[PDB]
DNA sequence: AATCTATCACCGCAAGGGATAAATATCTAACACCGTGCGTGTTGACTATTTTACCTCTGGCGGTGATAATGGTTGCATGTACTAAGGAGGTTGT
């Protein structure tokens, strides 16, 4: 009964509802990268292993 | 370098003259596949993918 | 019965003339054109149903006529027998069970 | 825009792989029967669908209390950087 607990939601609200999302924000271009020594910048293409 | 996130979204049912407000899935002929994933109370299941 | 006050007296939800706005001065064609649409759709379905049963299942509360009569002017248009004239207003619950039976009726919360 | 010799090779043309469709044999499903039980029908008695009537709820809102009470609260607009304007008034000048 911290789950089955209720709380007032002020005069104007009988009930409230929620959902949470595990958003798998994958590796992609336009996203940002860096290293420890102050190099900071955008991922500007993904290259085949030989395109390198 | 894939990252993982946890984020939150919410809704309400206001104090009406009776007291409750509605929560269900009826949105007919507007995007039906974006409805297929829900509880009796109009809510997604823990463990389901959504996009 | 305390929320009697607290439901509205804090800053007032959009309750047009509380609920009495359903029967007030708005009953003019500014609302009743939708009644003359729910009545049309119920007049459609309740005239494709069974040649006997299609009377009954319109009586008591205001469904289909400008005076939605008890027996005398309706029994004289049903013939043969009696208060099946009223029981079939409820019989629909059990072999009109098939929920598809409202497929052309439900729009009049929405127009 | 015709000619070809002389490239790098597709054809020249042997082999053989998979395929699918035939026949068989298995699966299931569609149905027709039967049985159940429910929502097939009228009738009848119930009790509380609605109306109106009556007797007597809830909540509309109007009305205003007296032993006496008779110098009040209110905190931070802002600290910088500029500079254009109006305001002051005595006076050494116009």
Resolution (Å units): 17.0
Q: Dig out the tokens for C92 from the structure.
A: 């629909």
- The rounded distance, in Å, linking the Cα atoms of C52 and C75 is 11
Asked if C52 CB < 7 A from strand D, the reply is yes
B29's tokens? 């002929």
CB-strand contact C7/D, under 7 Å: no
DSSP code of residue B44: B
Residues in A touching B21 (Cβ below 8 Å): 14-15
Q: Which residues contact A5 (CB under 8 A, 6 or more apart)?
A: none
Q: What's the CA–C1' distance between A52 and D9, in Å? A: 34
**Among A22, A46, A42, residue whose Cα is nearest residue A33:** A42
- Residue A34, SS3? strand
Measured CA to CA, the distance from residue B17 to residue A48 in angstroms comes to 64
Contact between B26 and B20 under an 8 Å Cβ cutoff? The reply is no
């Amino acid at each position: 009964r911290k789950i089955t607990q209720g709380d007032d939601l002020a005069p104007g609200v009988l009930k409230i509802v929620k959902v949470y999302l595990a958003v798998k924000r994958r590796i992609q271009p336009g996203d940002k990268m860096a290293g420890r020594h102050g190099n900071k910048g955008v991922i500007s293409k993904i290259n085949p292993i030989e395109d390198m | 370098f894939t990252t993982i996130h946890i984020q939150e979204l919410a809704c309400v049912s206001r104090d009406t003259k009776l007291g409750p407000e509605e929560i269900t899935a009826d949105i007919p002929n507007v995007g039906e596949a974006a409805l297929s994933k829900l509880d009796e109370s109009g809510i997604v299941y823990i463990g389901a993918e959504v996009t | 019965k305390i929320r009697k006050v607290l439901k509205i007296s804090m800053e007032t939800p959009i309750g047009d003339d509380e609920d009495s706005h359903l029967g007030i001065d708005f009953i003019e064609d500014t609302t009743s054109a939708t009644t003359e649409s729910l009545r049309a759709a119920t007049h459609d379905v309740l005239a494709g149903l069974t040649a006997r049963e299609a009377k009954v299942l319109r009586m008591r509360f205001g469904i289909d006529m400008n005076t939605d009569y008890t027996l005398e002017e309706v029994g004289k248009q049903f013939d043969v027998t009696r208060e099946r004239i009223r029981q079939i207003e409820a019989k629909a619950l059990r072999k009109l069970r098939h929920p598809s039976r409202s497929e052309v009726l439900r729009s009049f919360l929405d127009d």
